[PDB]
Amino acid sequence: SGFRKMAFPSGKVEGCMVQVTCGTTTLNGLWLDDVVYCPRHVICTSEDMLNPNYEDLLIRKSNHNFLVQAGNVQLRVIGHSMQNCVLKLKVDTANPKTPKYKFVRIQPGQTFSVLACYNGSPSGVYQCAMRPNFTIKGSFLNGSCGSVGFNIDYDCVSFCYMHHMELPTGVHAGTDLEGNFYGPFVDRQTAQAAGTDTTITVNVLAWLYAAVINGDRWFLNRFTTTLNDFNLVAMKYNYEPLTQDHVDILGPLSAQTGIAVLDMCASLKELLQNGMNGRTILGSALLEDEFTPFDVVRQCSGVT
């Protein structure tokens, strides 16, 4: 028992982190097979970043200008290319530590672990959610660019995120591993509107199920509701509308606890309307939305 914001073991990803330097800019790269992936803004200078002409900046760069160092060893760069907002540096040596991997574009509301790195060295690992507005509320300082987000299914790492920047609001933005930004963001130092965010309803319900499994049951009530009635409350409280696909994803947790999804919706409805009254659920005094139904089952079943 117990419920924690658990990250995947980061070992397989640690073995892929390298340092990429171009001119005076240093950031992190991901070395998979004979390719190092990194944010394309590694080729910029402070003057460039207000509106960089990436095509022109990259034309002035040659293979030998990209300094890639894996720990203490230097990699020889034999090709370079820009794909969307990422640079792909072909190296002459395949990473011997390359795990089985996939590149995936995650959906908003899904979760992943971030391995925060500086100068190609891992510093920490944390679990987070891709917000409905495509930002991530991460923890990143100068030099963290190129740190990646991932999920691990047994021996396969699915890389879903590469960190590109911090918005003026203090939230984070990045791309999939093909360099396509999540959200409307652009790799420029400009004011960028992140859309209206909402709370991930399916995750809050999944986390209420995790609470019941772990013994925190005070919020269970004698009520039920309908998808329509629940969605009127979710609208008022800036929660994502609950669909039958979400109810279906919550099926296993509903079966495990014997609490019908709409009955859990009625508990959530009461917590939204009345608050927690100074009480806590799984050590939290707010409604947590960073655990998916899959995460709750995985944590509550011990998948390795």
Add this chain to the structure above:
Amino acid sequence: SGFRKMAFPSGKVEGCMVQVTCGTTTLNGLWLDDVVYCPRHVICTSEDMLNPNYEDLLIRKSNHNFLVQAGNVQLRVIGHSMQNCVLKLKVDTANPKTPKYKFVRIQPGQTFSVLACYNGSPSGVYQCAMRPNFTIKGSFLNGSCGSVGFNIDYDCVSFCYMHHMELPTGVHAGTDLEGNFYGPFVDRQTAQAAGTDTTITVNVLAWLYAAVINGDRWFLNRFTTTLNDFNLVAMKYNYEPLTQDHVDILGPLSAQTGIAVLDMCASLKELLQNGMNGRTILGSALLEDEFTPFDVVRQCSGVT
């Protein structure tokens, strides 16, 4: 910017996890050099656990009865010994993945990362604190015994905890790597009183400094207090008394923010007496005590 419950990168510890089987019990072992460390209760059966005679149970066991498997390879056990509540299985092969390491006994209020494992396979990593009453509020299921707690200083892993059991209250208990339990706990299936717990005051103050650094400043007020006045409030709210050693440890954060420790104590005093009034600090609606002053500086400075 941003502040997360960040765990150390678990790679160096993942390479040390093995599966230990004795009879029908399987749990996790830590393979460092030519020794595998595991909880001594691996030699018990369900009937034994109410009050096991460990010396007698171990006498019936021979080297060949301890099945140690590192991934898919089997280790040959050439010696066994019990030290306090741990078993030390001498194997004929030194772990090639043994990082530079130390065994340390952490103090209550200090933090560490746990690499939760099942059948010798890592499943997840999370950050937690050793509670003032020597329990840990972890997330562990059946088979998690032998999972370890650690801290990493550059290339050196300081192992501080090995998981032994879940108390009937749902909190966790374990030992240092010499097998000495933290707290009054014994490795028996019995009702065991965990002492009165308190909130880690120095950590809550460190986390308020992390909040100021990251932009959450609403709780700062026009007041100050004394160590004596603050300690009367800390007594009433079951917080650890603040000492000058704690103020001294908070020196660097006080210098970074320019907010005197006693002025931050006055903000904490007001939050204890008035609550958060439906507001949040670093995404939390309660006062967080699982970040030490060292953790706050490390996260806010990017140590790798």
